[PDB]
Structure formats: structure tokens, C-alpha cells
Homo-oligomer: 397 residues x 4
């Protein structure tokens, strides 16, 4: 039996240190979850699991899906969990949920993600047994993660950014093209804001006293202003092109959806948007992580009996413009194809709040697939440490 997605939602996405800084990852999750149930009218006891992608957990919220369910006020009956496959964790939660559903184990579950990058921890592995002989190192969680993902044999001191630079180098990607992609990202996000489509996606968030519905970071952005910015690794390398302007930031948000059967959705009065056709996962070289989408997509299209040409709409994460352009090069893109890809924006304009990112992409794909009455959508992303995840979704009718 099929697995279908209903009411995929998100909060607004805040900047690191910005709008949502007073809010925990849990507060955002709850807000997204309350909104999901509130829009749906679903009885709390209908939810059989809450599965949440969450990339920077600590003991403030163990097994974060369960904490988020309780905090949202669902009954003690409702189980929950946390998953991490990096930048792909949101999609992963979704995939797990569909698997749990299709099997016939569960009829309805929640799949989501939450990240508060603003409030990620600083930690020490030196204070337990003492620093009397070694000193004390305290690591920023965001910063350390950037270099450790590849493990011991594939270190990257320059982190995520260094991977993109490698890509720009390997594909001869001009700075201009990169800045250009970014503009589109902003124009599209902004266009979406004012065309009213975004309200469909968003649960507004109350901050102790006002309520927020608009994503903080999308902006007036021109190729000319972007040309001005100084790349991060210019001193390390003089041919750098990656800047804050052409790359996604660090952000706060949550994403929620319902994963259910068509039969169950009909009973609960729900309106399913897509069903999951297939998915694929891949490993790639960690220093080349930005390319993980290509092998993963290939696997997914094959499982689907599908071709990329067959595909109506694409959500490809814009971790770095350079990274995205490289996948698009491999996909042999034509100026039209940029029509069907990232239509409402992406990481660069929106933000990249890592756990919630897969959800955001889904909310946009599925809903947009509806608005267009289009058949197939692709969701795919690169993963820090050398991974890729992709999923194929089909509109319901």
C-alpha cells in the first residue's frame, strides 16, 4: 500500500542569532507540530510515531521526536525519535515514515525536522576525567562538525566550503554564474512571499510579544552587490569564489508533515498531496560531498523506472551555489531546466537549518506540484561527510 504526505509544513526560517534565538529546537518543533494538528484536525491519538531529523542533539532534548510530541501536548502514548544523516536528515525521517507505513506497521505518523543552529552547544570531552594533565578544549558544535564528518582519513579543515571550492575548480564554474544563481534564489523566494504561496507552507511563530510568518533572510539582491563580497578562502587560495552571498547560512526552523495511507487519509478528512515513488542514497568522496545528489538521483530514478527528463520539478539543495551548479552540470541543464528547479527558492535565500531542511524542500515540492498539476517531483541533497539522498514523489489525484 502507498505512503502519502499530507499538510507538510514549516515554521519561518530564522538567521543564526536572529529572529528565533530565544527559541529552542524543541520550541520550534512544537510550534510546527501544533500547527500541523491544528490545520488537520487530527486527533492526537492518531499519531503513531514522531520521527525527527535533528543534526545537533544534546541532553536538553533526548530522542527529540518524543520530547517534541510531549511538549506539544500529545498523549504519553505517542512514541518518538531522532535521526541524523546530516543535511539529509529531514528527508530521511520522511523515508523512514513511509517505510513504516507501507509495511503496514503504522497507519499514520509524523515526520519532521528541527534545528536551532543559534543554540547549538559548546562541548568538552575533557571535563569528565579532568584537565589536570591535558588542558580543556571546548568545541563549538557547528564548527567542529564541519571538519569531522569525513572521519580520520578524509579530513577537511576548510569544512563544507572547501568542498565547494573543489567543485568550482573541477567544473570551471565562474563566480558570475554562482552569484547569478543566488539572485534567482532570492527573487524566487521573495516572489513566493508576495504571491501568497508561502502562507500555505508556514506555521507562524509566537515570540515573547509578536507573531512571525516571514522568513528572515531573503532580501534587492543583485549580481553587482554580490560581486563585492570577499570569498572566505581567498587568503588560502586566490581563486576562491564562495562567499556568504552565494552560499547558505546557519539557521533556525522546524518542519512537519503527516505520512499516511490513502485510506487513512480519506477517513480523517485529509488531503494527500504526493505519494513516494522511490528513493536513493549514495556515498561519495567527502571532499566532493556536493556531488552526492547525482549518484543518489540515479539510484532513485532507476528504482522508479524513470528518467530525469520525465521529472517535472526539482528541489536541489543549494548548500553552495557552486555545489548546485556542479550537479546541474552533470545533469546537463538547459535554461529551461532552471525553470523547473528550485522554483520557490532555496538554501541561499531561505536558510539551511539542517534538520528541518528536508521538510522545507518537501513542503515546497509537494504543494507546488499541486499548484502546477504536475506529476513527478524530485527531492535531493548533498550531505556533509560524503553523502547524497534523493526521493521521487508523485502527485495524488
Amino acid at each position: 500500500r502507498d505512503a502519502v504526505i499530507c499538510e507538510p509544513v514549516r515554521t519561518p526560517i530564522g538567521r543564526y542569532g536572529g529572529m528565533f534565538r530565544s527559541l529552542t529546537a524543541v520550541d520550534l518543533g512544537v510550534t510546527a507540530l501544533k500547527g500541523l494538528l491544528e490545520r488537520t484536525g487530527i486527533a492526537a491519538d492518531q499519531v503513531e510515531d514522531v520521527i525527527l531529523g535533528h543534526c545537533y542533539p544534546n541532553s536538553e532534548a533526548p530522542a527529540i521526536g518524543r520530547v517534541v510530541a510531549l511538549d506539544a501536548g500529545l498523549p504519553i502514548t505517542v512514541p518518538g525519535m531522532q535521526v541524523d544523516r546530516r543535511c539529509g536528515s529531514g528527508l530521511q525521517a520522511v523515508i523512514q515514515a513511509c517505510l513504516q507505513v507501507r509495511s503496514g506497521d503504522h497507519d499514520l505518523v509524523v515526520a519532521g525536522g528541527a534545528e536551532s543552529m543559534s543554540n547549538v552547544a559548546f562541548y568538552s570531552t575533557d571535563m569528565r576525567w579532568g584537565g589536570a594533565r591535558t588542558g580543556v578544549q571546548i568545541h563549538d558544535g557547528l564548527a567542529r562538525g564541519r571538519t569531522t564528518a569525513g572521519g580520520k582519513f578524509h579530513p577537511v579543515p576548510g569544512g563544507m566550503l572547501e568542498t565547494a571550492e573543489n567543485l568550482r575548480r573541477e567544473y570551471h564554474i565562474s563566480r558570475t554564474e554562482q552569484d547569478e544563481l543566488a539572485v534567482r534564489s532570492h527573487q524566487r523566494a521573495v516572489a513566493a512571499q508576495s504571491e501568497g504561496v508561502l502562507a500555505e507552507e508556514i506555521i507562524p511563530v509566537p515570540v515573547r510579544e509578536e507573531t512571525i510568518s516571514v522568513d528572515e533572510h531573503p532580501r534587492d539582491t543583485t549580481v553587482e552587490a554580490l560581486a563585492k563580497l570577499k570569498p572566505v578562502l581567498l587568503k588560502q587560495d586566490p581563486e576562491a569564489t564562495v562567499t556568504a552571498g552565494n552560499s547558505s547560512g546557519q539557521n533556525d526552523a522546524a518542519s512537519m508533515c503527516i505520512v499516511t495511507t490513502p485510506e487513512k487519509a480519506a477517513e480523517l478528512g485529509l488531503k494527500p498531496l504526493v505519494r513516494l515513488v522511490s528513493w536513493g542514497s549514495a556515498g561519495v568522496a567527502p571532499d566532493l560531498m556536493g556531488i552526492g545528489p547525482v549518484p543518489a538521483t540515479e539510484v532513485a530514478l532507476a528504482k522508479a523506472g524513470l528518467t530525469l527528463a520525465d521529472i517535472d520539478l526539482i528541489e536541489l539543495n543549494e548548500a553552495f551555489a557552486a555545489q548546485a551548479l556542479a550537479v546541474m552540470r552533470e545533469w546537463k541543464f538547459g535554461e529551461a531546466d532552471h525553470e523547473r528547479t528550485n522554483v520557490r527558492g532555496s538554501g541561499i535565500s531561505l536558510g539551511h537549518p539542517v534538520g528541518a531542511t528536508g521538510g522545507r524542500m518537501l513542503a515546497t515540492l509537494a504543494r507546488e506540484l499541486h499548484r502546477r498539476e504536475a506529476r513527478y517531483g524530485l527531492e535531493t541533497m548533498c550531505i556533509g561527510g560524503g553523502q547524497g539522498l534523493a526521493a521521487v514523489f508523485e502527485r495524488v489525484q
Copy 2:
């Protein structure tokens, strides 16, 4: 298609601050995984995913399955990830693994868990935007997490331990009953050591000599000796029963297995031990978290068309002896059922290296099933925060 478990293995289990103190979770993970690949002769490129239960993640190892896979020398083409459902994380990884294999997405994966409780971080959320007004707090990851898992509306100040005391009060479990259970646990584990069954389970770990034996189990453990210990929260409850002796510790370990189809195992020369029949999960009151196996087992058995009496072997996590005993009251157990339960030992004697516990149970359950030529096994655990997880396994007869 079926999902079957092949070659389920673990490292030995170190004590907190003990023999594996110098080892990261990743190091244990890598050793378990390498051992598994070595024992099986499997080409590395065969492994389509590595899913790992891991309950205290930090930035030293993001998405830990992937890191363990790289650090073990597997090719860059192999994906990996991290899962947390607390004390149920190892089972959860296995279940996810079966779902992926069964759907026909993957033909072979590794499921496992790793934990180093010895090296769990201390952490703060006050150092990034300033402690100017708040003050700064640094939290022990192990301690802080025992309290918060229930969230804001279900706080447990006493921790996992209070919940255990809660069950002891409700179900009227005596001190003697608990200590007694602890004794069996040590005797069964030690006996498992002497009988040589353990070697089949264990990946030896080199430390800078080589270790093949679990640290915690003690031959001389007696009831009279256990009676001497001071219950942890005597000060607060004079009726407290739960001591270090009758509860599990904090531990270091790793677990890995192969999850595969029967046709794929045949092709590769594997010996599949069990196939997964069903699972169930449940939520319970967070202050009563120890009872979680009862509803979960209920769900798993019923999906299986099975009854508790149908079950040949049970592994139930002994998080606390009062917690385990309470589950047994619901199950209406008797001295005889005690001979089909936790037969090689448990969390009390063995220790509770949390992301890897599900893995350790599975290794025993699967192997003991094969040793007994019995049919059905149940693996179930209580989960901090108020959860239960259960699975029913069937011996592969071939």
C-alpha cells in the same frame, strides 16, 4: 522478501571509566565492524548502508554510521547514519534495516550501535550569546539527559532511578527479589563466559594488549553481599531499594550485524540466524518508563499472531531489577519462565552501553536460539522518556 540477521557481534563491555576509557565510540564501532567483515569475508562494497544507534552524539562524530564506515576502511561509496530512541536505539537500527531490505531497496546493510559513556561530553547552551545575565551552566550529558527525556511536562528529577523506585512502590517489589535477580544475572553471564558461548559473540578489542572479556560480571556476587549496599535515594525515600548492585551501570561498547535477504546470504556464504517477524513500539508515562515493554510486546506479539507462551526465549533489558520484575508481574511470570529469560545475563551484570544494548541482546537471542533449536524469540526494552520497543524473531531453519 524476508529479512534475516547474520553474524551479530559486539565488543566486550567496559565499565565507566574503565578498560575502554581511552577509546572513542567510533573506535569501538570500527572494531566491531571490522571484526564483522573479517568474520564474514564480505566484500566491503556489498554493504549498502550502516545504521547505528547512538544516544550521546556530538561533533566529534557526526552521523556516526558514516564515520564508522570510513574509519573502518570501507569505500567512500557506503552511506551511514545515526538513530536515537534511547535504550531502544540498537533495535531501532535493526528494524530500520529490515524495513529497507524488505522493501527491496537494499540487499545488505549493517545495523548496530556504539556508545562510549566514558567519554560523553559536558555541554552548555549559555556560552554562545553570553552568560552575562543568565549565568553559565555546564551539563553532564549522562546526568542531564536522565531528567529531561520526558520533556517539560513530565520531569523526573531523580532520573531513571526514580522511575525504577516508582515501579517498586507500585508493584511491591522487595529488596530481596531485586538483589536475587541481580545474582542470577551475574551467574548466567559468568557461566556464559566459562561455557565458551561468549566467544562466538565477541570481537576482541586492542588497547594501548587485547581484550575479549566483559569487565563488570563477577563470580562472587551473592545476595548477602548485595544487601549491604546503600540504596541511592535512601536519603529521600527510606523505602528505597535500588542500589548500584541491582541496577546497571554506564558502559562502553559496540554492536554490529548484517541484515540481509535469504537469497543474498546464500550467495555470499553467510549463515542467517533469525528473521524478523514483527515489532511494536509504545509510549508510557515517563515516570513509569520501565513498564514500556509491556505494551510494546503486546503490539509485537499480536502482529505476529503470537502469545507470550509461544515464546521460547526472551531477552528483556535489565535496566533495573525492579523495572524488569515489574514487567514480569504483568506477564504473570513464575520461576520457570525465569529459565527462558535473559539466559546469558543482562544489563545488571553486563552493563548498559546504551546505543549498543539492542545489539547485544540480539546477538545473544539469535545465537541462543540457534544453540537451543528453538523457534521464537522476543527482544524488548524499556526506554527512558516513556517508551517501549519490542521485536519477535524466528530461527532460520535451513
Copy 3:
């Protein structure tokens, strides 16, 4: 032989988190020491000690007088040190300097204080040997310090603020009296800026932001300060609802440094210095910690006794206003008429100026000495309450 104070100076005084937040205590001291030397023309090697009052030391600068000297470009042959007597530390450094000069041991020394409250450390004693058993605590240096000063037998959980309320209560001082005093303080301070007397005291500070700019003015003082506005403000009330002490009527937390030269009249003459005052006597006392604000009364008593002097003998007083109530209590005990307020804290005080602890004694010295000259008065008194139950007072004579 006499000891005289030459060219007493200070930086501007910054608010906690404000102007100088990017500056260390060392940075401020160095700017002051350099300013002192630039003004004097003194060769660096004339300096035989740098003694600094510094109340929140850590290992960023051990023995901070030595570090401040080296960092200011003084030769390696110059010794330096750190002293702590809390709110009294700056004066204490002056007195030590004076004694080492008077004994004939040293001919010229530098006496000072530096404090950056903005940058005070957070610290833990649970980090060295393991946190598994106890938990790990980190303390804000500033906050923890308000309770510990009395030791175990006399903890004051309230802090300095509580000891002030204790004084209000004992001496029956209305919130009105307290609030009026604060007004004068801002008024005397502001007046002193426009009058231009402050430039004499101040070494200007450069801060790098768009450009690097130089600061000459104290952050905190306000002209617009009125009793009425001060009533709008909430005592620090839940605890005692007869609470009268607000952020408005007490000193805050601050960043500044102070320096001066201590020398013989004969040496000052050789080097072309203009000695302003000489030290006549000093006194120190202990009082109950929960009553710390009153410490000046006993210390002052002892100093005048040693001087053979009386309070009427005193033309100028600088009494630190840690709290308006604290200052008022001292003044009653001194039997102060309305006119005596004429000669006390004429250029402002802690409430308007701020209270950067190690540098405070230096700041007051700078006013008393210069004002004594501008006035052509004879005798000045410097005195302060000290956290933990102490007082320090000194008498100076214009030269």
C-alpha cells in the same frame, strides 16, 4: 622624607558592556601609564615599581603591574605587582608606594589601578579533577564575589546591595534623600566636564571600531538626571519591599585605569614634576560585613588621629558612593550640615562616574589632589567602604 603625588591621571570610565568592552584591564592600564609618562616626560627607567590595585585578577595578566609596564614599553628592568583590598585597592597601592618611597627604598614609583569589569572571567573549581560526582559549576567572577567577601561566618547573599539596605534601615534614610544625592553627583560631574576640569585628569583612549576613534568622556554621567525620573525606577523589591536602592542611586560596573607617580619632593624637582599633594596619614579599619558601608567612619577616625587632625580640619572630602544610602550613613555619623556637602565629592562620584573597583582609589585621588590645588585648600581626605567589611582613609596635604 616626604612622598608626594605627581600627575594623577585616569582614563575615562566606561560602563559595563559599553565603550571599552573590547579593551582589557591591561589595555586600559597601558593607555594610562603611557599617558602619565607622556605628560611628565619621565624616562622609563626612572620607574622603580608599578603597583596596581586590581580586584579581578586572572592569568591573562599575572602580577599586573609588571605586565602593564612591559606592555607599555618600559624596560625589562622595571618590577611590578598586584594588590587587592577590594574597593580600597587603588588607595592601597598609593599607600604602599608612599611607604616604599618614605623608607628611602625607592625614589620614584608608579601607583595605580586597572579594572575591566566587562571582561571579568567566568571560572570553575570543578574542572581540574572530574565533574562526574559533583556536577560542574562555573561562576561569574563578579556575582560570586558579592557574597564571598565576608567568609563563611558572615555570608551576605544579598551582596553589596543588601548591606546598603541594612544601612537605610538602621539610619532611616528616605528614598528621597538617596535619590537627591544621586542628582548632585551627576550634576557635579557634568558640570566638571563643561568647566573643563576633567581634561586635567583624563588620558584619552583610542578604540578601533570604519575607523579608530579616541574617547575623552565618561560614559555614564547625565545632565538630565532628576529626582522625578529616579522615582520611576524599581529597587533591585521582591525581597524587601521597603527597598530603596536602584541602579539609579548606586554605582554600576565599570572599566577604567588610574595612574600616578609617587616620589620625593627632591626627585620631583630634579625631573621637573609638579607635586600636588603629600600624604599625611592613613587609616584602616574593620567592620561587620553586613554593615560594610560604614567602614570609612572608623578608618577616618584612625587617620585623623594619626595626623593630629579633626574633621573640621579637613577642607575636602572624597567619599565613594558605592550606594547613596551607604554614603548618607557615613555622613550622619560625621554630623553633616548642608554646607559640608559643599566640600564633599565635588566633582562627582561613583554613582555618576561609575565604580571600576581597582581603579577607583586612583580616580578619587586624581580629583582630590587637583581640586585641592585649584582651591588652594590645605587638607584632603580620601576614604571608602570596602566589601567584606573594611575601610580605608587617607589624608593628603597640598604642597
Copy 4:
């Protein structure tokens, strides 16, 4: 009028993480002060200030002299304070006390030092306004201090060790000579213990109950050969390295107290003055060469006294590293006989270097020894981290 020292005393000195690990600096200070008062019968209202050398102060004890008086049950009328001049802070407290006294300002004061190196805080300056951009460092107070004492134009990444290796290089001091000095230091210290003289100095400390009277570090067995076996701390980077844990002083816990007064006031109280302070000197040296600071400092003090080094019966020189002390002794043109009159009851190497309390320890030995000997002149001198020296000359009272 003169300033004289009466009843100089100390606690025993314990090792880093040792016997006194559960005691604060204040605790040691209180015991020492209490013992001093118990011994002398001094009326608590006779003490006009308590001046304490304290090197690693924190908010646990502000103005530590005042806290110590209070905690030791002195009346609230008694003021107190803290001073730091590194390794010279204890002597610096004495010189201050003597100056306040000779002045006529006070008739009687207490001067001391207290250090608990065990409990020195770890700190950050990144927490207050946040590390959101910069990161967070936490510094060990001991290790961090060793690099910063010279300031930004003279950093010593090597710490005090690097200064000591700089001295052995410059002065060419062999490893054997360094080890020989260390051996003498242990032998002299142990001898002082057999002989019974040490009791004269020591205030026994109670810990929770057992009472401690003996310094922790000194060992009778120490030999050159055993010492040769140790490895120089800085060998990786210097092939010629000599300085080791064996021939350097450790990190230590202790307190020192004494009475400073005039002869007239001492006559009144029926006190027994031991020495009077003749002179003192202070000096600045290069921070990379800090160990040599005694040489210019001794020169100043001897000169002020109209005195010569030949005139000095007894010397207490801090043995911070054997190499540093040996270097000073070279400048001083010492011959075999000189070792006869220097550090006669042990030193920093055997006893320990509890930094705030070190000036007090040396004084207690010197004043007391000078009396037993019936000798006239004594010298106390130490090197100070960051590039300083302090020396004082003391003369036996008749």
C-alpha cells in the same frame, strides 16, 4: 624603629592533587593563622592587618587576608588583604608588613601566604559576551599564567621550563649537577625531619579524621642514578634538555604565617623576636631569563645594607629549577663550602613550591636556623615569573 619577625610558621606542604586536595587556600590559611595565635597567645585585637601573598586569587576568596582572619575567628575589627608578585608574594607581604610597622602606622601585623595549586580555577573570558563568533577557550590558571607573565612583547610558550633550559644553556649546567642539587635538597629536607627541627616550623593540619604534620614530597631514597632515569620535559624539542620533574619543583599546597612587629611591642607581649629586617631589593630581568632575578635583587639588598655576600651566614634561595638556582650560584661565584650555608633544611625541589606561601617557608627556616646557629645575617631571595627578583636581608636578634 625596627621590624622584627616572631613565630614564623607554616603548614606542611602537600603535593598537587595530594593530601590537601580537599582544602582550600583559605582552609590552609586559617589553620596556619590559628596555630600562630594558639602558639603565641596573642590577643586577636593586637593584629592590625593580615597581609597575604596569594597568586591565583578568585571570587571564592576576595582580599584573602580578610577572609582568612574572619574564617579563623578573628574579630571583624581586623583588616586584611592580598598581594601578588608571583613567587615573591610571600616575601612581598613581609616587606609590606615591615614597612607599615617601621612607619609607626601599625605596631603589629600578620604576614603570610597561602596557595592551593590543587584547586586553582579554570577560567574563560569568552563566556560573558558569548563565543558565537570567536569560539571559547578555557584556560588552566597554572599553565596559562606561565606564558603570559612577560606580556605580549616577551611571551614564553615554554613557560617556566623554557626559562630554566635557557639558563642551563647559557650557563652550561650539566644534568648531573642539576640532579646532584636535587639530591641534596631531599637529603636536607629529610634530615630536618629526623632531627626534629621541622616541628618548630609546622602547624599540623586536620583533614576529614587524621592530622598531618609531615611534608608530602621529600623522599629519603632519592639518588642521582635514579634521577638520571627521568626524561626531560622538553626533550622532544631540545636534544640538549635537562630539566625534569625530579630536578624542578612541583605544584604545591600550603600556608605561611608570621607576626611582624617592633621590638618594643614584642617586648610588651612577651614575644620572642627572631630576626629583624635589615634591607630588601627588587629587580627586573628578562622574562625569558627570569630565574636569574635573584642576582640583581640580592645586589640591591646587599648594597643597601652596606653588606657583601661574604658577610652572609645563611642563604635561602628558591630552588624553582635546579638549573635556575645553579645559575644564580654561578653568578655568586660559589664554591663547595657555599653549599654548606645555602638551603640547609631543603628547598623547593624537595619540599615543593606552593607559590604564595613560599616566601613564608623560607623565612621560617632562615630565621629559625639563624637562631639555632647563633649566626648574624641571612639572605632570602627568589626568582619571580615574568622577570623579577626579590631579596631581603635579615639579622638575628639578641
